[PDB]
Design a protein around this ligand. Sequence first.
Ligand SMILES: [Mn+2]
Ligand SMILES: [Mn+2]
Ligand SMILES: [Mn+2]
Ligand SMILES: [Mn+2]
Ligand SMILES: [Mn+2]
Ligand SMILES: [Mn+2]
Ligand SMILES: [Mn+2]
Ligand SMILES: [Mn+2]
Ligand SMILES: [Mn+2]
Ligand SMILES: [Mn+2]
Ligand SMILES: [Mn+2]
Ligand SMILES: [Mn+2]
Ligand SMILES: [Mn+2]
Ligand SMILES: [Mn+2]
Ligand SMILES: [Mn+2]
Lengths: 97, 97, 95, 95, 106, 106, 82, 87
Amino acid sequence: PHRYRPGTVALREIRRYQKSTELLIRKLPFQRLVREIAQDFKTDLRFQSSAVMALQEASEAYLVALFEDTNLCAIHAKRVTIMPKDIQLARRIRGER
Amino acid sequence: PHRYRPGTVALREIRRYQKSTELLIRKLPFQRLVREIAQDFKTDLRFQSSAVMALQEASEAYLVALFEDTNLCAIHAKRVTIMPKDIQLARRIRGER
Amino acid sequence: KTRKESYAIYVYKVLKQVHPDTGISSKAMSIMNSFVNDVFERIAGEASRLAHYNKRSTITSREIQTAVRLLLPGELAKHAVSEGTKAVTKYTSAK
Amino acid sequence: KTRKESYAIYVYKVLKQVHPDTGISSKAMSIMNSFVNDVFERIAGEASRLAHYNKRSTITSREIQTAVRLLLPGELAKHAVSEGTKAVTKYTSAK
Amino acid sequence: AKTRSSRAGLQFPVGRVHRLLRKGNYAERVGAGAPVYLAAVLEYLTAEILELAGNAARDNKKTRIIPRHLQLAVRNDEELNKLLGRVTIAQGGVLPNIQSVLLPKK
Amino acid sequence: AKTRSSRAGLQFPVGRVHRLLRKGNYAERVGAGAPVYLAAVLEYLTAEILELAGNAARDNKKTRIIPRHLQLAVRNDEELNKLLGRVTIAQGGVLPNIQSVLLPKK
Amino acid sequence: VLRDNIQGITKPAIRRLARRGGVKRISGLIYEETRGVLKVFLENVIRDAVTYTEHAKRKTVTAMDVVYALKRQGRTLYGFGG
Amino acid sequence: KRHRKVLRDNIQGITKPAIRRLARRGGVKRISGLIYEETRGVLKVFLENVIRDAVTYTEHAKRKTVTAMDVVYALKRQGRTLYGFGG
DNA sequence: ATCAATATCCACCTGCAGATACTACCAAAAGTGTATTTGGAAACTGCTCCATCAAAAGGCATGTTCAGCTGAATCAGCTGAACATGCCTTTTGATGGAGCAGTTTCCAAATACACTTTTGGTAGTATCTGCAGGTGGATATTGAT
DNA sequence: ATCAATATCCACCTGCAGATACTACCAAAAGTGTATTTGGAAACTGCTCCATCAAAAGGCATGTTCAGCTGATTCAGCTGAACATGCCTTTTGATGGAGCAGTTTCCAAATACACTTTTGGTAGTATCTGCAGGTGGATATTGAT
Ligand SMILES: [Mn+2]
Ligand SMILES: [Mn+2]
Ligand SMILES: [Mn+2]
Ligand SMILES: [Mn+2]
Ligand SMILES: [Mn+2]
Ligand SMILES: [Mn+2]
Ligand SMILES: [Mn+2]
Ligand SMILES: [Mn+2]
Ligand SMILES: [Mn+2]
Ligand SMILES: [Mn+2]
Ligand SMILES: [Mn+2]
Ligand SMILES: [Mn+2]
Ligand SMILES: [Mn+2]
Ligand SMILES: [Mn+2]
Ligand SMILES: [Mn+2]
């Protein structure tokens, strides 16, 4: 019976996803959300396939960079665990709040 | 002989400066700094005095807003004392890095 | 002895309408003048781009309106849009 | 049908000058084209403002040059300026 | 001869705005409605800020609007604040604000 | 006839750049040298990125530049990174980077 | 088995994003915080793209609409035109 | 012209109390001893960046005098738009 | 809680900097009226490329376990706030003179056509190949003891 | 330490999705040439306001003291990482049709263009006023006890 310690697979994952460039959110659920949010602005919209892709690329680049700032915020408080207050601090300082 | 406790005068100064709008750096020293820096880019420059005042309003608003972000980074660390690591964090998150 | 336009007098007219007994310092007026030019440049710019994106050589009240919706937050956009429509509608019948 | 211009062919040429054995994927070429568009707009943009600030009707290579110094970081600015100056000379001194 | 301003019922100079759009190099052509709509947005916006700033002035027992009043007016208003989110009002200072944890006792 | 690109010594199209400046509403007038100058600047920067992106391709055992290599080229170069500091390269991913304090205690 | 669209942005997916952002350990509360942040991000962008769609009198949101929306939010994207 | 004094170490003209005052306006209650050098360093970067672009506008116009407008445009370029000086 | 130091809050109070008021001018707006050109809206339609859905694929919801991380509690040490004290540096108001900026004159350079040759983009077509995945096997890394 | 499980590295293989070479064509750059307008450098100098300075006005530098903050130490309990797999959501790819985009057309409104009137800016000269900064003197706030 075999067991890797907590954080061991995490590091393995960091290295894996930092090596690659594929999108990390499944496309369909992302698309539905996009259309839902769009429905509040105008009804009966269609979307170029590439348009959703653009939004996904943009949204994933944004969240990945936010997690970097979030992680610096956590580490600044001498933790290794990211918490909502880390996200909050990052966004407040980025000028998004 | 009477003594205010540490913190008390400092809170009094916060209210005092938050209430007013005058520039907080003495004019001449600031003006020399501007001329020193400019001269190192280009010799034999003159300055409209309103040019120097514009740079001073801009720098003072920049520093006050940075100190606010810095305060937030310290408090996030559960301190009340701002430190170089706090400013460095704020500047990193802001994209000045 | 070259002429330098500002929006000062128009800012002053509007001030009298909304606060008939209140004055404005020359520095506050300078800031008001900077704010009007600033917003002007920001709307005209959006309008400029928007036209370029659509292969239009003409900036119309319609480009101005989209620019206003891109540029102003929520409730200011709503009101700016009514104020602008209303002036153009009124303008159209008045010659 | 309608004509869609791109910097692709000219980007391909420069690639062959710089890595004659190296190719480029579509998506990469598409990014490079955006890059060229983006930088053009940024430089032309700044050149436009410079001309306006100085009450001039013309965007000359002097405005392009200053725009370049305003937008590009040090070492990148330096080479761009010389590459630009060099090309305006070669163009002048040739029938 | 009625000004194009009065035709649209505006204080702001429609003539001026039309001209500035041309000199401004924004497009080949300016539509006749454009300076009208723009001048009214401009007037609206300046009414909004003068209203608010006027109130700050009164709240302070002052008769004259100074840069401090414009700053209070802008920063106390969610939408103006965001619209001027990247703007500095000289001689405006900041909003009184002190973080909880900095206060004495408990 | 000899093209202005060839006269200038450039791959990048001086004619197009010239036309694009006129039709882009940047000023009433465009000097004859300006499109030469700008085309050169654009070519230069294209060469600098391609240089570095080609290298990153070589390092990764490949002959075809993909977006990954463009990203690596840009974010490993201090200056290119600053110019593109607010740009997202689709399909670029990130630089391999782990904060030291997260590294397993040896 | 009905489910909110936003919840379609799953924990493992958010975990992956954090991972690429170099995050080692994640609190349970982060997943909801992220979905909220994505929602605000998408609202701001789509609102602007849609506005570009309406201006052009189309019923389809184009890549360019989105590209232009991103450019004006100061989040320039390369790879889809422009 | 005959002689003109040498400008050096003017950064120290940004004194401890001046910095402390700025930190008060920004809501700061307690200041570590090393903040003062850090702040000077940060300010100098800020000034170098704005002065460089301002001076660039100056030279472009062919003046020897840096105008309020030179500064106001440098600020606008860097996304730190300033109202109150003609800009 | 009560006593005493010192900051704070007003209210009124004269100087005055900056704001407001006219009377004159005027160049450049802004308007007006006709002559002349065209941007783009309107309406028709072809064919991408988008929403939909069936069959095929393969990621995630799931509950349990416990490692190791977070936050609470305690506390020595020392850094930073407060304040006293001694006096240097900045602020302020006044003045020759640099350089900005105001007007005018003039041509090298730009815009505008027109007419002539070319090229970049497209589209049909066929032809080619770098490299993502697959495999298989050695070798390294992690965790158990 | 040895050891076994399982991840990771690399060398080689190959099908195919996306790169590429080659032809034919055309509208629209792109260029060359000729007739014409003008933007702005130049050459001069009015005159605003910048560097400079002397005297006046007030903030800064410094050292001593200790209050209380930070950072170190330990610890217990809470909370998120790891775990394996079949249900069920997403992916794939096939197919009608919606709408973007290509083309033609035609006039409401664009620019230009010349005399006609108006008006916003400034400049010269004058009186008026909101409030800054001084004052004393009643009302908190703070910190020792
Ligand atoms: Mn020097
Ligand atoms: Mn119309
Ligand atoms: Mn080479
Ligand atoms: Mn037409
Ligand atoms: Mn406990
Ligand atoms: Mn200790
Ligand atoms: Mn002189
Ligand atoms: Mn060809
Ligand atoms: Mn492989
Ligand atoms: Mn002229
Ligand atoms: Mn002493
Ligand atoms: Mn335990
Ligand atoms: Mn149809
Ligand atoms: Mn008048
Ligand atoms: Mn007072």
